Structure formats: structure tokens, C-alpha cells
């Protein structure tokens, strides 16, 4: 059984085994190396791999990671301090607001909607009711801070400097007088001074022309009666007038009343009592009063 | 003599002078060499001269050769949560009310005093003031009732005279004016019969007043007390058919009793006479109110 | 024959002794049956699978990008949602009258306690307040009305009327009701007998004493104060005699002046006669009264 060449021991090998000069070696890629005389795994640097516990193992932070079914797994305890902080905000916070409350979602700012006329914010940031002036109508008015009665309604004085005219059955004449005027509540008082006139008739008219002669702030319209231009027998009274023709006057008791106001002219009736022939009349001071027009 | 190799220990084996090596999965032939086999891409790689693990350097780092999370992984999440915690609303104090389950903030208000207008604003509820006559609503404000300031009426009734056994009656038509707290009865001129030195004139307001004025509306604020109010002088023409002699008498309001107003007429002397001519006279006095 | 002879030496990790070859192995390499194997003690994420050495990871938490271990972005989805949810609408700051305490996370509101309060029901409410009123406007049985005292007050004067004229001086004790109604005062003198009078003269009412409480002297001052006026001018008939039948003269009376609590009335006109005694009619004196 003679083959020319007799192989003895080992004459060949398969990769990664190789033979050079009758010496056998093993080729090694990166990752495999020699540690002393033994084949070793090479783990350059520090990347989480290490030779420990008898072999190749992967290392990880035992607070952040764990192994479940031989799978790298996040420990749930690494998220917990996040979930409890959020959960602590979810348990109670404001997401929406109802009027008068207003939340601007984009600025995260909360404010309150109020009404200027009724409410105001003071110098302390407090919400407060605005101190409002109540709606009043003369003669009701603001009096030193409160709801009162206007002093101008209670009393007002002025003067009329003007013409008194007598008319009656052809008898004719006029005189100039200065008179105080007092307006008190809903009345006007015209305080005529004593004056001298001429012939009067049994019945006649004494007219006061308020179209001119009223001193500011009074105007003609302020002498209009509350009964306006109706014909009345208002404030009828008895006046004594001295009649004469140069000599000793005879005092006649006459009847006088406010009868009508028309277009600024107050007309007073003067009648009754006796009559005599005479050329002169000595009139007494006479106050004439009546209720005054208002608006 | 033999110097060769005749047997080998695993993982080496020999058949017919040829040696081979047995390899499990994970070890493999790469070109001529033994190599670690790493199928797919699972983070493992042969690099920098050996076996290494590969990790996103934004999320992980290595500390004492352990895989570790970068702290900067959570920086965004911790900053955001901190951005809320540092200042937010978790609770509300009345009248502010927070429902924790719906995250709704609303305000508790009193429906009688406050309200929310169409503008969605908080505004004080308008309240009409409580007013007592003669204070009243005048064209929308607190004013003085026009009716208290001036009221016109009329009396058509009997005036009667009584003095020292002289008696007689007359009918008159008189305007009445009520102005603030006074009443004025404007009697017209009238004729009568004989009068005494002193006597009483009576106005019977029980009948004759124009609706809606009533008898009680003529009651003095001094009610039925006896007074000497509004004393004045009046001239009365006394005659017996001829030319009258005018006597100056003294007249005042003396008492109202049950709708009848009494005026005293006395003084000024006396003559013998059968007829009297009375002037127009206005009678005024403070009027009753409740 | 000519023999091949073969291998006679070897390099680590192979070694030869007495015709036997062995291979030295360090930790991490081990025998698995007759094969060479990677040793992986325990479970640390490493495994032999799919043909070789692989690393294993939770596929919900990690992924492989560029062959680098990486965090799935879906790991942070539950958290990014909740945070965002709060972010899109929450209260960070409050404006007066609202006040947020950034530390206690407590929101309240600042109110003025003089005009506003919190009731029993926890509601916000305006405090009920009485309107501010000025006499003669007053609280009348619950509402805003006209004070009854201003509408009618009654009192009395018990004192001396004095006449003065052309060297004539005399005085007379009288009593009179006083009525104050709205802005007027009325003094109701009774008829009385006096003595000689002149053509013109002054009748004076001394209000310094004799007014009944709660009326005071000052209460009789006219709204025109101490101005000299011709107010309430009227006719009065006065009987003049020397003990016999009086002759009645028509005189002119009016309010002339009030001064230091004494009211003066002018009385003039209508002629005259020699006489020693005067019979005065009842006279009511009225004028607008002073107010504060
Ligand atoms: C993390 C990683 O890269 N994994 C690789 C893996 C790894 O490199 C080795 O296991 C380490 O030793 O190799 C895997 O197979 C690859 C092929 O994709 C190797 O064979 C590798 O790449 C080459 O593969 C050739 C290709 O040239 C040719 O196109 O296709 C044939 C098959 O048809 C071969 O696969 C390559 O891409 O060129 C040749 C190269 O020399 C090889 N490297 C080594 C070190 O031998 C694997 O193990 O499955 C693929 C895996 O993704
Ligand atoms: C990630 C992992 O699985 N690690 C394993 C590890 C790993 O598979 C190898 O290192 C990779 O080559 O192997 C570890 O040891 C085990 C046994 O503890 C291996 O020997 C492995 O186990 C098997 O179980 C055998 C039984 O078949 C036998 O009857 O009894 C023995 C002693 O109890 C074992 O139980 C198995 O899983 O089937 C046999 C199997 O063939 C073995 N695998 C290989 C590749 O030879 C280790 O290294 O310690 C365990 C470690 O968890």
C-alpha cells in the first residue's frame, strides 16, 4: 500500500488555521486578540462592555436601566419625579375662566372685566363702587355733598325798576317805581313802594310792565304765574287810597287783586269802595303775591 | 521518533491529516481570519481595534463603564415644568371659585346687587331710589312733584254769616289754589244782609268742591285748633238801599271743624243797615299733610 | 517512502505538547460541545441569535439609528402631551383687583370693604347704604322725602310789642302763635289797645325773650337778614279815640327791618286826629325766614 509520499500527523488545515514553515497559526480579526497565551476578546476603551463574571457582559446604571427578558429596559423610577410634579399641577389648576373673569391663553394673564361708570379700581388695587352723583331735578340739588333743596329755590331777591300804568273809563296815566322782588319757594312777591297817581275810576286796571326793568338774573318770564295767562281773582285784598283835588285827601277803601298776566305785563284789578270827584290819587305801599310758573 | 501532531483538543479536530476548527454562531470566518459575527445593526460593532457598543451621544454617556442617560435628556422637560410651577393658580378664595376637576374659574356674585352686562362686564345693578311725596320721579330724576308745586281746583258752595242773632247765606264760585304747603281760597265779591259788630263767616266745604279735590283736602295743618291766622282788614259797604258806607272790619281764619271753615269778622265800628256789599277776599292757610 | 511529516510547532493561542495540539481560552471564550463559543453569563442584554452576537432592547423605548442605541421619541409622548395640555391654557399672573401669590399658588381678589363685602352665601355684594341727605330733604318712613318739620312747625311768643313815633313811646304785653311753614314764618298778633300814635311810626316785636322752646331768637331772622325793606305792605284799620267812639283810620303797615332779634314794622298814612287811645286790629306778620 505504497503512496509515494506518506503524510504523517497534520499536513493541512482550514482557515482560520494556517501553516507556514511547518508551524501552525490562527488569523485574528479586530475584536479577537491574545492575552498571554490565550485567545481573548478585545474590548477597547469604555463602551459598556466588559469581561466579568466569567464572560462577556454589558454594564448599565442600575438606577436608570434594568434587564427584562434579556432586554435593556428603562426603570420606571427615572420618570416618576416627573410624573408626580405634573400630577401635582393636574390635580388643581385654572385652564378656563368665566366672565367677568378673562384669561388670555397666549399670555397666561388673568384679568377682570368691569364697568367704568359703576365700578373702579382704587389706589390700593381694590375693586370698589364708584361714588356716583345721583340724578337730581331742580329744585332738588346737590347741597354741600348731599341730596338737598336748592338755596336758589328757597330764596332769591332782585328788583324791578319800571312803569306802572293805570287805565279805566278814559282815565289814563303812568308812574315809575323801584320795587323789591322776592322769590320764595313756588311764589313771587312784588313789593311795590307807595306812589302818587292821578284820577282813578270806580273800576280800573293797574298794569306792571315786566318786559323791561327786571334786574339780572331775573327775566320777564320769571314773573309768569303758575296759572299762566288765565283770568283770576287771586290774592284779593283791601287797599286804602287817598283822593283829593289839592286839598285834604279822602281815603277810599278799594278792592285789589291779581287778575291776569299777558306777555310780560301783570294786570291788577282795582275797584269797589266809594267814589268821589278828584284829580289826584295817593297810593299806599302794596305787596302783590302769586304762585310762580315752573318747568 | 515522531515530532508531529496526532491529536487535538476541541475546538480543534483532525481527519486524514487535516485539522479544522469548530465554531458556534457568533464566531465566523472572515477572509482568512476568525472574526466575531454581529448580524444586523444592534449597537455592536468592530471598530477602533475591537468590539465596541455604539450609543447616541446626545442621550447616553458612559460612567465607570456603565451605560448612563445624559442629564441633558430631561433638561427640556424639567425646565418646562419649572416654567409652570414657579407661578400658577392652584387655588381660589371666595368670591373666586375654582373647580379642580374641570379647571374652571368663576366668580360668586349677589344677583340683587351686581350683574354682568351684554359687554360681559361686572356692573352694579341699577336701583330706583325710594321716594316719598312730594319728592318724586321727575322726567327720570329725583325731583319735586309738579302736583305739590301747583294744583288748581274750584269750590261752588254756600257761605253763611252768623252774628248776634243775625243769619243769612250766599252762594259763591271760587277758584282754589294749592301751592306747596298752603291752600288759597279766592272768594269772589258778594252781597249779603245785616251784620253785627262781631260775627262769623262760614265756608261749607262739605259740598261743592270739584273732583278730585275732597273735603279733607281743605283741613289746616293746625287741624281744628282755634287760631288767629291771616288776620287782615277788609272793607264792607253797609247800606239800607242808598249809597253804601264802607266799614273797615278785621277778618281772620279762626277754625276748621268737620269740613267747615270759620272766619271771624269783627271790629271797626257799626251803623244801622240792612244790606252788605263784601269785597273779593282771598283766604289762605297752611294745609294738612300725611 | 518520502514522508510529509507536517506541523511541528504552533503559535498562541495554539500550543503543542507530546504530539497533541490544544488552544488556550480566556474568559469570554468557552467550549460549547466541540465548538468554540462566546460566553455570555446571565442576562445583560447580550445574546447569540439570528446567526451571531446581538444586543437586545425594549422596542418601545429604544431603537437603532445609524447602528447607535437611541431613545424612541414615543417614550416621551405621554409626558409631552400632558405638559403641552397645561401650557396652552393656564393662569401664570393675575391683574388687580385679582392677586395671585406665586409661592402659595393661591388666587384672591382685593376689594374695598367700605363699598363692598362678602356675604354669608360666599357671594360678592355691595354694602347697603343710606343716601346722603340734607335738610329739609330727609328720611321719611323709609324713603327720601320732605321733612315734616320743614312743612309745618308751631310755636308761641309771649312778649312786648313797642310803639315809637314822634316822641310817642309805649308798650303792650301780648301772646301770639307762630307758624313756620316751608320757607316762611308767620307771627299772629291779636287785637290790642295802645295809646297815642303819630302819622307814621314803628311797631317793634322784641323776640330776644318770650319764644317758646325749641324756637330761638335767631329763628325769627328774615331771609333778607337785616336789610331794610318794604315787605308785606298792606292796609290796617286802627281806631283812634279819647275814651269815646273810636274813629277808624286806614293806615299802611309793612315789615321794615329785623335787627338783633327785634322785628320792626312801619305803620303810616291815612291821616290822623287828636286822640289818646288806639284800638289795633289783629295783624298777621309774615316773611321768608332765614335758613342754613
Ligand atoms: C454592525 C455590522 O456592521 N454588522 C454587519 C456584520 C459585521 O460587520 C461583521 O459580523 C463583523 O465581523 O457583517 C454582516 O455581513 C457583512 C455583509 O453585509 C460582512 O460580510 C462584511 O461586509 C461585506 O459583505 C460582503 C459584501 O461585500 C457583498 O456585497 O455581499 C457579500 C454577500 O453577498 C458579503 O456579505 C461587505 O459589505 O463588503 C464584506 C466585509 O468584508 C464583511 N466584513 C467582515 C468583517 O467580514 C453579518 O455578519 O451579517 C452584516 C452586518 O450588518
Ligand atoms: C443570554 C444567555 O442566554 N446567556 C446564557 C449563556 C449563553 O447562552 C451562552 O454563553 C452563549 O454561547 O449560557 C449560560 O450557560 C447555559 C446553561 O446555563 C448554556 O450552557 C446553554 O444552556 C442550555 O441548558 C443546558 C442544558 O441543555 C443541559 O442539559 O443542562 C445544562 C446545565 O443545567 C444547561 O441547563 C440551554 O439553554 O439549552 C444548553 C445550551 O446548549 C447551552 N448553550 C450553548 C450555546 O452551549 C452561561 O454562559 O452561563 C447561561 C447564560 O444565561
PDB file of C-alpha atoms in Angstrom, chain B residues 70-219:
ATOM      1  CA  UNK B  70     -27.359  62.142  29.776  1.00  0.00           C
ATOM      2  CA  UNK B  71     -28.904  64.558  32.287  1.00  0.00           C
ATOM      3  CA  UNK B  72     -29.498  66.946  29.392  1.00  0.00           C
ATOM      4  CA  UNK B  73     -32.045  64.414  28.170  1.00  0.00           C
ATOM      5  CA  UNK B  74     -34.587  65.787  30.631  1.00  0.00           C
ATOM      6  CA  UNK B  75     -33.484  69.430  30.770  1.00  0.00           C
ATOM      7  CA  UNK B  76     -36.277  70.500  28.404  1.00  0.00           C
ATOM      8  CA  UNK B  77     -38.899  68.614  30.418  1.00  0.00           C
ATOM      9  CA  UNK B  78     -37.691  69.921  33.784  1.00  0.00           C
ATOM     10  CA  UNK B  79     -37.401  73.497  32.546  1.00  0.00           C
ATOM     11  CA  UNK B  80     -40.930  73.447  31.126  1.00  0.00           C
ATOM     12  CA  UNK B  81     -42.471  72.019  34.289  1.00  0.00           C
ATOM     13  CA  UNK B  82     -40.457  74.542  36.299  1.00  0.00           C
ATOM     14  CA  UNK B  83     -41.793  77.244  33.991  1.00  0.00           C
ATOM     15  CA  UNK B  84     -45.268  76.439  35.310  1.00  0.00           C
ATOM     16  CA  UNK B  85     -44.625  75.607  38.962  1.00  0.00           C
ATOM     17  CA  UNK B  86     -42.782  78.856  39.693  1.00  0.00           C
ATOM     18  CA  UNK B  87     -46.106  80.671  39.257  1.00  0.00           C
ATOM     19  CA  UNK B  88     -49.604  79.365  38.542  1.00  0.00           C
ATOM     20  CA  UNK B  89     -53.090  79.211  40.045  1.00  0.00           C
ATOM     21  CA  UNK B  90     -53.829  76.078  42.071  1.00  0.00           C
ATOM     22  CA  UNK B  91     -56.495  77.517  44.398  1.00  0.00           C
ATOM     23  CA  UNK B  92     -59.046  80.357  44.615  1.00  0.00           C
ATOM     24  CA  UNK B  93     -60.571  82.264  47.537  1.00  0.00           C
ATOM     25  CA  UNK B  94     -64.234  83.329  47.602  1.00  0.00           C
ATOM     26  CA  UNK B  95     -65.840  85.030  45.839  1.00  0.00           C
ATOM     27  CA  UNK B  96     -63.383  83.397  43.415  1.00  0.00           C
ATOM     28  CA  UNK B  97     -64.279  79.749  42.815  1.00  0.00           C
ATOM     29  CA  UNK B  98     -62.098  77.075  41.174  1.00  0.00           C
ATOM     30  CA  UNK B  99     -63.488  73.681  40.151  1.00  0.00           C
ATOM     31  CA  UNK B 100     -60.415  71.420  40.215  1.00  0.00           C
ATOM     32  CA  UNK B 101     -61.892  68.679  38.021  1.00  0.00           C
ATOM     33  CA  UNK B 102     -62.915  70.899  35.098  1.00  0.00           C
ATOM     34  CA  UNK B 103     -60.204  73.527  35.644  1.00  0.00           C
ATOM     35  CA  UNK B 104     -62.809  76.293  35.563  1.00  0.00           C
ATOM     36  CA  UNK B 105     -62.592  79.647  37.340  1.00  0.00           C
ATOM     37  CA  UNK B 106     -65.739  81.670  38.020  1.00  0.00           C
ATOM     38  CA  UNK B 107     -66.949  84.325  40.467  1.00  0.00           C
ATOM     39  CA  UNK B 108     -69.725  84.193  43.078  1.00  0.00           C
ATOM     40  CA  UNK B 109     -71.872  87.348  42.992  1.00  0.00           C
ATOM     41  CA  UNK B 110     -75.133  88.605  44.526  1.00  0.00           C
ATOM     42  CA  UNK B 111     -77.886  88.743  41.893  1.00  0.00           C
ATOM     43  CA  UNK B 112     -79.725  91.628  43.577  1.00  0.00           C
ATOM     44  CA  UNK B 113     -76.749  93.996  43.797  1.00  0.00           C
ATOM     45  CA  UNK B 114     -74.458  93.010  40.894  1.00  0.00           C
ATOM     46  CA  UNK B 115     -74.732  91.627  37.352  1.00  0.00           C
ATOM     47  CA  UNK B 116     -72.913  91.001  34.065  1.00  0.00           C
ATOM     48  CA  UNK B 117     -73.975  93.224  31.168  1.00  0.00           C
ATOM     49  CA  UNK B 118     -74.082  92.406  27.453  1.00  0.00           C
ATOM     50  CA  UNK B 119     -70.492  93.648  27.346  1.00  0.00           C
ATOM     51  CA  UNK B 120     -69.595  90.849  29.760  1.00  0.00           C
ATOM     52  CA  UNK B 121     -68.521  93.407  32.351  1.00  0.00           C
ATOM     53  CA  UNK B 122     -69.214  93.395  36.083  1.00  0.00           C
ATOM     54  CA  UNK B 123     -71.595  96.255  36.891  1.00  0.00           C
ATOM     55  CA  UNK B 124     -73.692  97.383  39.869  1.00  0.00           C
ATOM     56  CA  UNK B 125     -77.395  96.623  39.431  1.00  0.00           C
ATOM     57  CA  UNK B 126     -79.408  99.813  38.894  1.00  0.00           C
ATOM     58  CA  UNK B 127     -81.739 100.537  41.814  1.00  0.00           C
ATOM     59  CA  UNK B 128     -84.614 103.025  41.684  1.00  0.00           C
ATOM     60  CA  UNK B 129     -84.459 105.233  44.800  1.00  0.00           C
ATOM     61  CA  UNK B 130     -87.243 105.017  47.373  1.00  0.00           C
ATOM     62  CA  UNK B 131     -89.127 108.350  47.169  1.00  0.00           C
ATOM     63  CA  UNK B 132     -91.844 109.894  49.333  1.00  0.00           C
ATOM     64  CA  UNK B 133     -94.263 112.564  48.087  1.00  0.00           C
ATOM     65  CA  UNK B 134     -93.759 115.453  47.491  1.00  0.00           C
ATOM     66  CA  UNK B 135     -90.365 114.095  46.454  1.00  0.00           C
ATOM     67  CA  UNK B 136     -90.960 112.215  43.205  1.00  0.00           C
ATOM     68  CA  UNK B 137     -89.576 110.971  39.903  1.00  0.00           C
ATOM     69  CA  UNK B 138     -89.436 113.935  37.535  1.00  0.00           C
ATOM     70  CA  UNK B 139     -88.506 113.095  33.955  1.00  0.00           C
ATOM     71  CA  UNK B 140     -86.219 110.309  35.174  1.00  0.00           C
ATOM     72  CA  UNK B 141     -84.629 112.035  38.164  1.00  0.00           C
ATOM     73  CA  UNK B 142     -85.241 112.735  41.845  1.00  0.00           C
ATOM     74  CA  UNK B 143     -87.303 115.927  41.899  1.00  0.00           C
ATOM     75  CA  UNK B 144     -90.233 117.797  43.422  1.00  0.00           C
ATOM     76  CA  UNK B 145     -93.668 116.585  42.336  1.00  0.00           C
ATOM     77  CA  UNK B 146     -95.305 119.115  39.995  1.00  0.00           C
ATOM     78  CA  UNK B 147     -98.587 118.411  41.786  1.00  0.00           C
ATOM     79  CA  UNK B 148     -97.235 119.654  45.124  1.00  0.00           C
ATOM     80  CA  UNK B 149     -95.872 122.776  43.448  1.00  0.00           C
ATOM     81  CA  UNK B 150     -99.210 123.810  41.928  1.00  0.00           C
ATOM     82  CA  UNK B 151    -102.750 122.387  41.967  1.00  0.00           C
ATOM     83  CA  UNK B 152    -105.860 124.215  40.763  1.00  0.00           C
ATOM     84  CA  UNK B 153    -109.427 123.437  41.734  1.00  0.00           C
ATOM     85  CA  UNK B 154    -112.718 125.172  42.391  1.00  0.00           C
ATOM     86  CA  UNK B 155    -115.383 125.493  45.076  1.00  0.00           C
ATOM     87  CA  UNK B 156    -119.032 126.250  44.327  1.00  0.00           C
ATOM     88  CA  UNK B 157    -120.776 126.370  47.660  1.00  0.00           C
ATOM     89  CA  UNK B 158    -122.515 128.179  50.461  1.00  0.00           C
ATOM     90  CA  UNK B 159    -121.017 130.950  52.550  1.00  0.00           C
ATOM     91  CA  UNK B 160    -123.038 131.731  55.654  1.00  0.00           C
ATOM     92  CA  UNK B 161    -122.960 134.558  58.205  1.00  0.00           C
ATOM     93  CA  UNK B 162    -123.814 134.334  61.884  1.00  0.00           C
ATOM     94  CA  UNK B 163    -123.533 137.169  64.388  1.00  0.00           C
ATOM     95  CA  UNK B 164    -125.588 138.204  67.419  1.00  0.00           C
ATOM     96  CA  UNK B 165    -128.685 136.511  66.045  1.00  0.00           C
ATOM     97  CA  UNK B 166    -128.210 137.844  62.536  1.00  0.00           C
ATOM     98  CA  UNK B 167    -128.106 134.981  59.981  1.00  0.00           C
ATOM     99  CA  UNK B 168    -128.002 134.630  56.182  1.00  0.00           C
ATOM    100  CA  UNK B 169    -126.401 132.662  53.356  1.00  0.00           C
ATOM    101  CA  UNK B 170    -124.975 133.206  49.899  1.00  0.00           C
ATOM    102  CA  UNK B 171    -123.681 131.085  47.032  1.00  0.00           C
ATOM    103  CA  UNK B 172    -120.227 131.792  45.545  1.00  0.00           C
ATOM    104  CA  UNK B 173    -117.982 130.399  42.841  1.00  0.00           C
ATOM    105  CA  UNK B 174    -114.331 130.427  43.914  1.00  0.00           C
ATOM    106  CA  UNK B 175    -111.044 129.189  42.493  1.00  0.00           C
ATOM    107  CA  UNK B 176    -108.866 127.246  44.876  1.00  0.00           C
ATOM    108  CA  UNK B 177    -105.098 127.056  44.524  1.00  0.00           C
ATOM    109  CA  UNK B 178    -102.804 124.805  46.468  1.00  0.00           C
ATOM    110  CA  UNK B 179     -99.148 125.734  46.351  1.00  0.00           C
ATOM    111  CA  UNK B 180     -96.504 123.922  48.373  1.00  0.00           C
ATOM    112  CA  UNK B 181     -97.867 123.574  51.898  1.00  0.00           C
ATOM    113  CA  UNK B 182    -100.594 126.247  51.592  1.00  0.00           C
ATOM    114  CA  UNK B 183    -104.153 126.409  50.334  1.00  0.00           C
ATOM    115  CA  UNK B 184    -105.732 129.600  48.968  1.00  0.00           C
ATOM    116  CA  UNK B 185    -109.459 130.076  48.550  1.00  0.00           C
ATOM    117  CA  UNK B 186    -110.141 133.034  46.304  1.00  0.00           C
ATOM    118  CA  UNK B 187    -113.635 134.177  47.226  1.00  0.00           C
ATOM    119  CA  UNK B 188    -115.356 136.492  44.695  1.00  0.00           C
ATOM    120  CA  UNK B 189    -117.214 139.695  45.700  1.00  0.00           C
ATOM    121  CA  UNK B 190    -120.745 139.049  47.027  1.00  0.00           C
ATOM    122  CA  UNK B 191    -123.753 140.709  48.663  1.00  0.00           C
ATOM    123  CA  UNK B 192    -125.307 139.860  51.988  1.00  0.00           C
ATOM    124  CA  UNK B 193    -127.615 141.290  54.610  1.00  0.00           C
ATOM    125  CA  UNK B 194    -127.126 142.917  58.013  1.00  0.00           C
ATOM    126  CA  UNK B 195    -124.038 142.069  60.061  1.00  0.00           C
ATOM    127  CA  UNK B 196    -123.211 142.536  63.745  1.00  0.00           C
ATOM    128  CA  UNK B 197    -120.163 144.264  65.255  1.00  0.00           C
ATOM    129  CA  UNK B 198    -118.626 140.812  65.633  1.00  0.00           C
ATOM    130  CA  UNK B 199    -119.606 137.576  63.888  1.00  0.00           C
ATOM    131  CA  UNK B 200    -118.508 134.516  61.917  1.00  0.00           C
ATOM    132  CA  UNK B 201    -118.405 133.703  58.245  1.00  0.00           C
ATOM    133  CA  UNK B 202    -118.517 130.003  57.404  1.00  0.00           C
ATOM    134  CA  UNK B 203    -117.337 128.213  54.265  1.00  0.00           C
ATOM    135  CA  UNK B 204    -119.031 124.859  53.874  1.00  0.00           C
ATOM    136  CA  UNK B 205    -116.555 122.649  52.045  1.00  0.00           C
ATOM    137  CA  UNK B 206    -118.610 119.501  52.753  1.00  0.00           C
ATOM    138  CA  UNK B 207    -120.187 120.029  49.326  1.00  0.00           C
ATOM    139  CA  UNK B 208    -119.233 121.974  46.206  1.00  0.00           C
ATOM    140  CA  UNK B 209    -115.579 121.033  45.695  1.00  0.00           C
ATOM    141  CA  UNK B 210    -114.639 119.928  42.159  1.00  0.00           C
ATOM    142  CA  UNK B 211    -113.426 116.310  41.873  1.00  0.00           C
ATOM    143  CA  UNK B 212    -110.846 115.080  42.633  1.00  0.00           C
ATOM    144  CA  UNK B 213    -110.433 117.573  45.486  1.00  0.00           C
ATOM    145  CA  UNK B 214    -112.142 116.291  48.664  1.00  0.00           C
ATOM    146  CA  UNK B 215    -113.408 117.920  51.861  1.00  0.00           C
ATOM    147  CA  UNK B 216    -110.406 116.614  53.817  1.00  0.00           C
ATOM    148  CA  UNK B 217    -108.084 118.426  51.396  1.00  0.00           C
ATOM    149  CA  UNK B 218    -109.094 121.742  52.984  1.00  0.00           C
ATOM    150  CA  UNK B 219    -108.014 120.829  56.524  1.00  0.00           C
TER     151      UNK B 219
END
